[PDB]
Design a binder for this molecule. Structure first.
Ligand SMILES: *C(=O)c1nc2ccccc2cc1O
Ligand SMILES: *C(=O)c1nc2ccccc2cc1O
Length: 8
DNA sequence: ACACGTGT
DNA sequence: ACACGTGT
């Protein structure tokens, strides 16, 4: 759920 | 059980 | 070495 490198 | 990678 | 959780 978070996006810090991908954002799922 | 499956779904994540770029940005220091 | 540190930096992540919402949504099926
Ligand atoms: C988002 O909350 C979240 N995203 C994920 C992406 C890929 C793998 C695990 C994973 C867990 C969570 O909680
Ligand atoms: C992004 O590429 C990315 N983000 C993260 C966030 C939190 C923890 C690990 C992590 C690894 C990567 O690759």
């Amino acid at each position: 759920x978070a996006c810090x490198x991908a954002x799922x």
